[PDB]
Amino acid sequence: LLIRKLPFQRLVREIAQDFKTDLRFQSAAIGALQEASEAYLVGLFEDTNLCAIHAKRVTIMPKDIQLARRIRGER
DNA sequence: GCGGTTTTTTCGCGGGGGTCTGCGCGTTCGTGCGTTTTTGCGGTGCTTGTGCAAAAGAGCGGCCTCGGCACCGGG
């Protein structure tokens, strides 16, 4: 895993702090969340690279991300 | 639901060195200048055709009196 394990834990807790106050986490929940997040982001970067190559470029730009999320059907 | 075991999460500290960052020059790729090949709406001259004053005689149709006859009623 490329992201670390403690900043990601803090991010997850911060996000979870909105839906219910003072929620405990479990052995393999944060690990699964990190695996899913990194897999998702790698797929998104694959699609972004495809779009950037389509535009005859090598640099990925935010509009490529936006196009990828639009075609995937993401809101 | 309640008691058990014991893993691996949370807690804190020290050290390393890869990653971030200040600084410079160059270039490659982003942006504007100019153009290629073609599509489209703009108009015309000409073709082909349209709706908007008596006088007089001659001739005529209707008509009417009349001629003349056949006919009903009776013996």
UniProtKB/Swiss-Prot annotation:
PTM-bearing positions, type Phosphothreonine: 21, 48
Domain of life: Eukaryota
GO molecular function, one term: RNA polymerase II core promoter sequence-specific DNA binding
Gene Ontology annotations of biological process type: cell population proliferation; embryo implantation; male gonad development; multicellular organism growth; muscle cell differentiation; negative regulation of chromosome condensation; nucleosome assembly; nucleus organization
Impact after mutating residue 62 to R: In BRYLIB1 and BRYLIB2
Record note on quaternary structure: The nucleosome is a histone octamer containing two molecules each of H2A, H2B, H3 and H4 assembled in one H3-H4 heterotetramer and two H2A-H2B heterodimers. The octamer wraps approximately 147 bp of DNA. Interacts with HIRA, a chaperone required for its incorporation into nucleosomes. Interacts with ZMYND11; when trimethylated at 'Lys-36' (H3.3K36me3). Found in a co-chaperone complex with DNJC9, MCM2 and histone H3.3-H4 dimers. Within the complex, interacts with DNJC9 (via C-terminus); the interaction is direct. Interacts with ASF1A, MCM2, NASP and SPT2.
Protein name: Histone H3.3
Organism: Homo sapiens (Human)
Gene that specifies this protein: H3-3A
Included range, full protein: 61 to 135 of 136
